[PDB]
Amino acid sequence: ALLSFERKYRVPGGTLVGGNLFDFWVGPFYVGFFGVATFFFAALGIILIAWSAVLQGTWNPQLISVYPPALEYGLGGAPLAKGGLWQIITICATGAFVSWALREVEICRKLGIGYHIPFAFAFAILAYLTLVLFRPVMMGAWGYAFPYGIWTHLDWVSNTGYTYGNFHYNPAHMIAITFFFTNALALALHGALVLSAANPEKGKEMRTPDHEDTFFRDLVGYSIGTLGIHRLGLLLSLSAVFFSALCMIITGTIWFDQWVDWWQWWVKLPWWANIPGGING
Amino acid sequence: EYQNIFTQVQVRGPADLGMTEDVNLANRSGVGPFSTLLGWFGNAQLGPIYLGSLGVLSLFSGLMWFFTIGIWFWYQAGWNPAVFLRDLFFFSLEPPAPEYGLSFAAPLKEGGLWLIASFFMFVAVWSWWGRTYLRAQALGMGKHTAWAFLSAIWLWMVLGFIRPILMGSWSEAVPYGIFSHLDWTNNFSLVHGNLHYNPFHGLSIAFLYGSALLFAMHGATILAVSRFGGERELEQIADRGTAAERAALFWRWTMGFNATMEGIHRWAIWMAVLVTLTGGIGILLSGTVVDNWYVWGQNH
Amino acid sequence: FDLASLAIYSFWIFLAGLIYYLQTENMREGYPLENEDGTPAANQGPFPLPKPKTFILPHGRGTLTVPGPESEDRPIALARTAVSEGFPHAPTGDPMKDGVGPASWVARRDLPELDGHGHNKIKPMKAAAGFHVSAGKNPIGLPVRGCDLEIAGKVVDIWVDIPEQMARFLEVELKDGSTRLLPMQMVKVQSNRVHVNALSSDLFAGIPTIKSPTEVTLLEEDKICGYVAGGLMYAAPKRK
Ligand code: BCL
Ligand code: BCL
Ligand code: BCL
Ligand SMILES: CC[C@H]1c2cc3[nH]c4c(c3C)C(=O)[C@H](C(=O)OC)c4c3nc(cc4[nH]c(cc(n2)[C@@H]1C)c(C(C)=O)c4C)[C@@H](C)[C@@H]3CCC(=O)OC/C=C(\C)CCC[C@H](C)CCC[C@H](C)CCCC(C)C
Ligand SMILES: COC1=C(OC)C(=O)C(C/C=C(\C)CC/C=C(\C)CC/C=C(\C)CC/C=C(\C)CC/C=C(\C)CC/C=C(\C)CCC=C(C)C)=C(C)C1=O
Ligand SMILES: COC(C)(C)C(=O)C/C=C(\C)CC/C=C(\C)CC/C=C(\C)CCCC/C(C)=C/CC[C@H](C)CC/C=C(\C)CCC=C(C)C
Ligand SMILES: CCCCCCCC/C=C\CCCCCCCC(=O)OC[C@H](O)CO
Ligand SMILES: CCCCCCCCCCCC[N+](C)(C)[O-]
Ligand SMILES: CCCCCCCCCCCC[N+](C)(C)[O-]
Ligand SMILES: CCCCCCCCCCCC[N+](C)(C)[O-]
Ligand SMILES: CCCCCCCCCCCC[N+](C)(C)[O-]
Numbered sequence: 001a002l003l004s005f006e007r008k009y010r011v012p013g014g015t016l017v018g019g020n021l022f023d024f025w026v027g028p029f030y031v032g033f034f035g036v037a038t039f040f041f042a043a044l045g046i047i048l049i050a051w052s053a054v055l056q057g058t059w060n061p062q063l064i065s066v067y068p069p070a071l072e073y074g075l076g077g078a079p080l081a082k083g084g085l086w087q088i089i090t091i092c093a094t095g096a097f098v099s100w101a102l103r104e105v106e107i108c109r110k111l112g113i114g115y116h117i118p119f120a121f122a123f124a125i126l127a128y129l130t131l132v133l134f135r136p137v138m139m140g141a142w143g144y145a146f147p148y149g150i151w152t153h154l155d156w157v158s159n160t161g162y163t164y165g166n167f168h169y170n171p172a173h174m175i176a177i178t179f180f181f182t183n184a185l186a187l188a189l190h191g192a193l194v195l196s197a198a199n200p201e202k203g204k205e206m207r208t209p210d211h212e213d214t215f216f217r218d219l220v221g222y223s224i225g226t227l228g229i230h231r232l233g234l235l236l237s238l239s240a241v242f243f244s245a246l247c248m249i250i251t252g253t254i255w256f257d258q259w260v261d262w263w264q265w266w267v268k269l270p271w272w273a274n275i276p277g278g279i280n281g
Numbered sequence: 282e283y284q285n286i287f288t289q290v291q292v293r294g295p296a297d298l299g300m301t302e303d304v305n306l307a308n309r310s311g312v313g314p315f316s317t318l319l320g321w322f323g324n325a326q327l328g329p330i331y332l333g334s335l336g337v338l339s340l341f342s343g344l345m346w347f348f349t350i351g352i353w354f355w356y357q358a359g360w361n362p363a364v365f366l367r368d369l370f371f372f373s374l375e376p377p378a379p380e381y382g383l384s385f386a387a388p389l390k391e392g393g394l395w396l397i398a399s400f401f402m403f404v405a406v407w408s409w410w411g412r413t414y415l416r417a418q419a420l421g422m423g424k425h426t427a428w429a430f431l432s433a434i435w436l437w438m439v440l441g442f443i444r445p446i447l448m449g450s451w452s453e454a455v456p457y458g459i460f461s462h463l464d465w466t467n468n469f470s471l472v473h474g475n476l477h478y479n480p481f482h483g484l485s486i487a488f489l490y491g492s493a494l495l496f497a498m499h500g501a502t503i504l505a506v507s508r509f510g511g512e513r514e515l516e517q518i519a520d521r522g523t524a525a526e527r528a529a530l531f532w533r534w535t536m537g538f539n540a541t542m543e544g545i546h547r548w549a550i551w552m553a554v555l556v557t558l559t560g561g562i563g564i565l566l567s568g569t570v571v572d573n574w575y576v577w578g579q580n581h
Numbered sequence: 582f583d584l585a586s587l588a589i590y591s592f593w594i595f596l597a598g599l600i601y602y603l604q605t606e607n608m609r610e611g612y613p614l615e616n617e618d619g620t621p622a623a624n625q626g627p628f629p630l631p632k633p634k635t636f637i638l639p640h641g642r643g644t645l646t647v648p649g650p651e652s653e654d655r656p657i658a659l660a661r662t663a664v665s666e667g668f669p670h671a672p673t674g675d676p677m678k679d680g681v682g683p684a685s686w687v688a689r690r691d692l693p694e695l696d697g698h699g700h701n702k703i704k705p706m707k708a709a710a711g712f713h714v715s716a717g718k719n720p721i722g723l724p725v726r727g728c729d730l731e732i733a734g735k736v737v738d739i740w741v742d743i744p745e746q747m748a749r750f751l752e753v754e755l756k757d758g759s760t761r762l763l764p765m766q767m768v769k770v771q772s773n774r775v776h777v778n779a780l781s782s783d784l785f786a787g788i789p790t791i792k793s794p795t796e797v798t799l800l801e802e803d804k805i806c807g808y809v810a811g812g813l814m815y816a817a818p819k820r821k
C-alpha cells in the first residue's frame with residue numbers, strides 16, 4: 001500500500017548496482033541490490049546466532065551469548081564453537097550495516113534529497129567497528145572485542161572500564177558524555193519548541209517561527225534558528241559517537257594505566273607540584 | 282555538492298526585536314552585537330533577553346550557589362591561587378556526615394555550607410523553571426518546554442533532595458565537585474550491586490542512546506530536504522510540502538514506517554524526557570526498596 | 582512482587598500506550614493507505630486513524646483539520662509498469678516538466694509564507710531595506726555555470742528570509758532577459774562563479790517562473806525546488 005501522496009515519487013532510477021533488476025518495493029520497503037545484500041547478511045547472521053544457541057544449550061534470549069575467541073587465539077581464526085561463530089557473525093553484521101547504509105543512499109538518489117542520513121549512520125558503524133575490529137586488532141586479539149549477549153555485553157563494558165580504574169577519568173570519555181547529555185537536552189528543547197508553537201494555548205492561533213525565536217531570546221538571549229538547530233543536533237549526536245570511538249581506540253593501545261593518573265600531569269607541574277596545602281599537598 | 286552544514290553567504294539586516302504578544306516590553310534589554318562567527322552555523326543576532334523578577338531571582342540565587350562553592354574551594358586551597366588552579370577539579374563541598382541525619386545543625390565546615398549552597402541551587406532552578414513557563418505563556422505558546430524541563434528537574438530532585446530524605450540523611454546527596462561527583466557516581470553503583478542491572482537504568486541508557494539516534498536521524502533528514510525548505514517545519518505542518526513528503530518516504534522505504542512533520546517532534550520530546558524520567562525512578566528505588574540490583578535481578 | 586517489580590511492569594504498560602499514541606499521531610498525513618490505483622487499501626495496519634485535530638492558522642488564513650479527505654489536486658504523468666503492486670511507475674512524458682519523481686512538487690497554497698507580523702517571509706534583497714551581505718562571497722554579479730560547464734546567466738539579486746536573516750534563493754538573469762530563482766542549498770558560490778551541478782545551462786529556462794517580481798508563493802517554491810533537485814537524476818546525461 002502507498003501513502004496518499006507517494007505514487008508520484010515511485011519512479012524508476014537511482015540505483016547504484018543492478019540497474020532495474022532490484023528496483024522495486026515489497027510493501028513499504030524499497031529493496032534494491034543492497035536490500036538483497038542486507039537480507040542475505042542478516043539472515044545468515046541470525047542463523048549463526050541460533051546455531052550458537054544450540055551449541056550453548058539454551059533458547060532463552062536473555063541467556064544466549066556468542067563469545068569471541070580466547071586471547072590465546074590472537075588475531076587468527078578460531079573454531080566455530082570456540083569463537084568462530086562470533087567471527088563470522090561479526091562479518092555478517094558488518095555486511096548488514098554497510099549494505100543498509102548503501103541502501104539508504106539509493107533511496108536518497110531516487111528521492112533527490114541529500115545524503116546526510118547514511119553519512120550520519122556511518123558514524124554509528126565506525127563506533128561498532130572500533131570495538132570489534134580496530135581496537136582488538138591494535139591490541140592483538142579478537143578476544144578484546146565484546147560478546148554478543150544482552151547481559152554479557154554489559155559485563156564486558158564493566159570489566160573493560162574497571163581495568164583502568166574509574167573510566168570516568170578518561171578525558172575523551174568526559175567529552176563524549178557531555179555531547180550525549182547536551183544532545184538529549186537539545187532534542188528535548190527542540191521538540192518542545194515546535195510543539196509549543198504548533199499547539200499554542202487554547203483560544204490561540206497557531207504560532208509562527210518568529211515566536212520560536214522570540215521565546216528563546218526572551219529565555220537565554222539567543223536563538224540559533226530553525227536551520228541551525230538541525231545542524232546542531234546532527235553535530236551533537238555525531239560528535240558524541242566520534243569521541244566515544246576515540247575514548248576507546250586509545251584505551252589499551254596508547255594508554256594502559258588508570259585514567260585518573262592521566263590527570264597528574266596538570267597536578268605535578270614542577271612549580272605548584274610541591275607547594276604545601278590543598279588536596280594534593 | 283553543497284551540504285548546508287555552514288552558511289555560504291551570510292546576510293544581515295535590522296535587528297529583530299521579536300514578537301510582542303503579552304510580553305512586558307519593560308523587561309527586554311536592548312539588542313546585542315551580531316556574531317559573524319555564529320552566523321556560519323546559525324543566527325548571528327545576540328539578544329534581546331527578557332529579565333524579570335524570576336530571572337533576576339534565578340540569576341542572583343544561582344550566583345550565590347556558585348560563590349558558596351567558590352569560597353569553600355578557596356578555603357580548601359588555603360587561599361593560595363596556585364593551589365587553587367592545581368587542585369581545582371579535586372576540591373569538593375560535601376554534604377553533612379550521616380551523624381547529622383536530616384538536621385540543618387551541621388557546622389559550616391561539616392556540611393552546613395553544602396546545605397546553604399543547595400538552598401540557593403534549589404531557588405535558582407525552580408525560579409528558572411517558572412521562567413520557562415511564563416515566557417511561553419506571554420507569547421501564547423504551549424508549555425511543552427516547562428514540562429520537558431520538569432523531567433530533568435525530577436532526576437535532580439531525586440539525587441539531592443527526595444532520595445536523601447527517604448534515606449534519612451543528607452550524607453546520601455551528591456557533593457559539589459568535578460571529580461568528587463564522578464567518584465560519588467561510581468560508589469553509588471558499587472554500593473547498590475551494579476546499576477547495569479537496574480532496569481530503569483537500562484531504560485535510561487536506551488533513551489539516551491535513542492536521543493542521539495533520533496536527533497541524528499532528524500537533523501540529517503531536515504538538512505537533506507532543506508533544498509525544499511524543510512526546516513520551515515511550522516508551515517510544513519500547516520501546508521505539507523514536498524520536503525515533508527520526501528522526508529517521510531525516505532524513512533517509509535527504509536524501515537517500513539514514518540512520521541509527520543509535527544509527529545516527529547512528539548517522538549523527540551518523549552525520547553528525551555524519558556531519559557531523566559526513568560533515571561529518576563531507578564535512583565529513587567536504589568537503597569529505599571532495592572539494596573542490590575544484581576541480586577534483585579536474578580529473581581525477575 | 583516488590584515495589585520495584587511493580588514499577589518496571591507499570592512502566593512497560595505505560596510505554597506501550599505511549600507508542601500507540603505516538604504512532605497514531607504520526608498518521609495525520611498520508612493516511613488511509615491506498616492501492617496503486619488510488620482506491621483505499623484493504624490492510625491499513627493495526628493502528629487506527631487518529632481523530633481530527635484543528636489548527637487555527639494565523640493571519641486569517643483559515644483552519645487546517647487533519648486527518649481529512651486527501652487529494653493531490655494535480656495530474657500525475659506516470660503509468661504502471663507491472664500488473665502486480667510494488668514496481669516503479671514510469672513517466673509518460675518529460676518528468677522534469679511534468680513534475681514527477683525527484684522533480685515532484687506538492688500543490689501547496691499559492692500564497693507566500695508570512696512572518697509573525699503578516700509580511701512576506703521571503704523578499705528580494707533590493708526590496709529588503711537594510712539587508713546586505715555581511716560575510717562570505719557576495720554572488721551578485723557572478724556568472725552562473727551549469728553542470729555542462731556553460732554559463733546560463735548572472736546573479737542579479739538574493740532573496741532573503743528576513744525573520745531568520747538567511748539567503749534562500751539566488752535570482753539569476755538568463756540570456757533572454759528574464760530571471761529565475763535558484764535554491765541556495767543547490768548552488769556552490771565560488772570566487773569567480775556560481776556553479777549549479779543539478780542543471781545544465783540550457784535547463785535554467787525550464788525552471789518555473791514566479792508571477793510577481795517581489796514575492797514567491799509556497800506553490801512556486803515547491804515547483805522551483807522540485808525542478809532543480811530533479812535535475813540530479815534527469816539532467817545527468819549531460820553532466821560533465
Ligand atoms: C562500569 C562501566 C564504566 C564505563 C566504561 C565504558 C566502556 C568500556 C565503554 C564506554 C562507552 C561509552 N560510555 Mg562509559 N563507562 C562508565 C560510565 C558512563 C556514564 C555514567 C553516567 O557513569 C556515561 C554517561 C557513559 C557514557 C558512555 C558513552 C560515551 C559511550 C557509549 C556510547 C557509544 O559508544 O555508542 C556508540 C554506538 C554504537 C556502538 C552502536 C552501533 C550500532 C550499529 C552500527 C547498528 C546496530 C543495528 C542493530 C543490531 C539492528 C537491530 C534491528 C532490529 C530491527 C531492532 N559511561 C563506567 C565508569 N564506557 C563505550 C564507547 O565509547 O564505545 C565506543 C565503551 O565501549
Ligand atoms: C554503546 C557501548 C556498548 C554498550 C553498552 C550498553 C549499556 C551500558 C546498555 C546497553 C543496552 C542495550 N544495548 Mg548495548 N552497548 C554496545 C553495543 C551494542 C550494539 C552493537 C551492535 O554495537 C547493540 C545492537 C546493542 C544493543 C543494546 C540493547 C539490547 C539495549 C538497548 C539499546 C538501545 O535502545 O539503544 C538505542 C537504540 C534504539 C532505541 C533503537 C532500537 C534498538 C533496539 C532496542 C536494538 C535491539 C538489539 C537486539 C536485542 C539485538 C540484535 C537482535 C538480532 C535480531 C539478533 N548494544 C557497546 C558494546 N548497551 C542497555 C540495556 O538495557 O542492555 C540490556 C544498557 O543498559
Ligand atoms: C560506575 C558508574 C556506573 C553508573 C552510575 C550511574 C549513576 C549513579 C547514575 C547514572 C545515570 C545515568 N547513566 Mg549510568 N552508570 C554506569 C554506566 C553507564 C553507561 C555505560 C556505557 O556503561 C551509560 C551509557 C550510562 C548512562 C546513564 C544515563 C542514561 C543516566 C544519566 C541521565 C542524564 O541525562 O543525566 C544528566 C541529567 C541530569 C543530571 C539532570 C540535571 C538537570 C538539572 C536540573 C540542571 C542543572 C542546572 C545547573 C545550575 C547548571 C549550570 C548552569 C549553567 C548556566 C549552564 N551509565 C555504571 C554502571 N549512572 C543516572 C540515572 O538516572 O541512573 C538511573 C544516575 O543518577
Ligand atoms: C551515530 C549517532 C547515533 C545513531 C545514528 C543512526 N543510527 C541509524 C541511523 C543513524 C543516523 C540510520 O539511518 C539507521 C536507521 O535506519 O535507523 C532507523 C540506524 C540504525 N541504528 C540502529 C541501532 C542502534 N543505533 C545506535 C546508536 C546510534 N545510532 C548513535 C547514538 C544504537 C546504540 C546501541 O546506541 C543502536 C542499537 C538500527 C535501528 C538502525 C540500523 C539497522 C540496520 O543496519 O539493519 C541491518 C541489519 C539488520 C536488519 C540485522 C542484522 C543482524 C546481524 C547480522 C546479527 C546481530 C549482530 C549484532 C552484533 C548482535 C549483538 C547484540 C547484542 C549486543 C545484544
Ligand atoms: C521530519 O522528517 C522526518 C520524518 O518524516 C516526516 C520521519 O519519518 C523520521 C523517522 C522517524 C520516526 C518514524 C520516529 C520513530 C523512529 C525511531 C524511534 C527510531 C528507531 C527505529 C526503529 C527501532 C525501527 C527500526 C526498523 C528496522 C531496522 C526495519 C526492520 C528491517 C527489515 C524489515 C528488513 C528491511 C527490508 C528489506 C531489506 C527489503 C526486503 C528484502 C528482500 C530480499 C525480501 C524522521 C527522523 C524525520 O526527521
Ligand atoms: C574566583 O573564583 C570564585 C570564588 C569567584 C568562584 O566563583 C569559584 C567557583 C567555582 C570554581 C565553581 C565550582 C562549582 C562546581 C564544581 C559545581 C559542581 C556541581 C556538580 C558536579 C553537580 C552536583 C549537583 C547535585 C546536587 C547534590 C544537587 C542538590 C540540589 C537539591 C535538589 C536541593 C537540596 C536542598 C536542600 C538539601 C535544602 C535547601 C532548602 C530547601 C527548601 C530544599
Ligand atoms: C550563544 C551565546 C549567548 C548566550 C547563550 C546562553 C546559552 C544558550 C546558548 C545557545 C542555545 C542553543 C539552542 C539550544 C536549543 C534550541 C532549541 C530550538 O529548537 O531552537 C531553534 C531556534 O532557536 C528556534 O527557531
Ligand atoms: C563484508 C565486510 C567485512 C569487513 C570487516 C569485517 C571484520 C570482521 C572481524 C572478524 C575477522 C575474523 N577472521 C575471519 C579474520 O578470522
Ligand atoms: C560505511 C558505509 C558508508 C556509507 C555512507 C556514505 C555516505 C555518502 C554518500 C555520497 C554518495 C555519492 N555518490 C557519488 C554515490 O552519489
Ligand atoms: C513530565 C514530562 C512530560 C512530557 C511533556 C509532554 C507534553 C504534552 C502535553 C502538552 C501540554 C501543553 N499545554 C496544554 C500545557 O499547553
Ligand atoms: C519512545 C521510544 C521507545 C523505545 C523503546 C526501546 C526499548 C529498549 C529495551 C531496553 C531493555 C530495558 N531493560 C528493562 C531490559 O533493562
Ligand SMILES: CCCCCCCCCCCC[N+](C)(C)[O-]
Nearest residue numbers: 027028029536537538624626627
Ligand atoms: C521494536 C522494534 C520493531 C520496529 C520494526 C517494525 C517493522 C516496520 C513497520 C511495519 C512494516 C510492515 N507493514 C506492517 C507495513 O506491512
Ligand SMILES: CCCCCCCCCCCC[N+](C)(C)[O-]
Nearest residue numbers: 558562584587588589591592595
Ligand atoms: C505502582 C506505581 C509504580 C510506579 C509507576 C512508574 C511508571 C509511570 C511513569 C509515567 C509517569 C506519568 N507521566 C507524568 C510521565 O506522564
Ligand SMILES: CCCCCCCCCCCC[N+](C)(C)[O-]
Nearest residue numbers: 591592594595596597598599602
Ligand atoms: C502508570 C500509567 C499506566 C499505563 C497507562 C498509560 C498509557 C497511555 C500513555 C499516555 C501518553 C499519552 N499522552 C497524551 C500523555 O502523551
Ligand SMILES: CCCCCCCCCCCC[N+](C)(C)[O-]
Nearest residue numbers: 537538539600604625626627628
Ligand atoms: C522503537 C519503537 C517504535 C516502534 C514501531 C511502531 C510503529 C510501527 C507502525 C507500523 C504500521 C505502519 N503503517 C503500515 C500503517 O504505515
Ligand SMILES: [Cl-]
Nearest residue numbers: 332333335336
Ligand atoms: Cl523573568
Ligand SMILES: [Fe+3]
Nearest residue numbers: 194499503514
Ligand atoms: Fe525539527
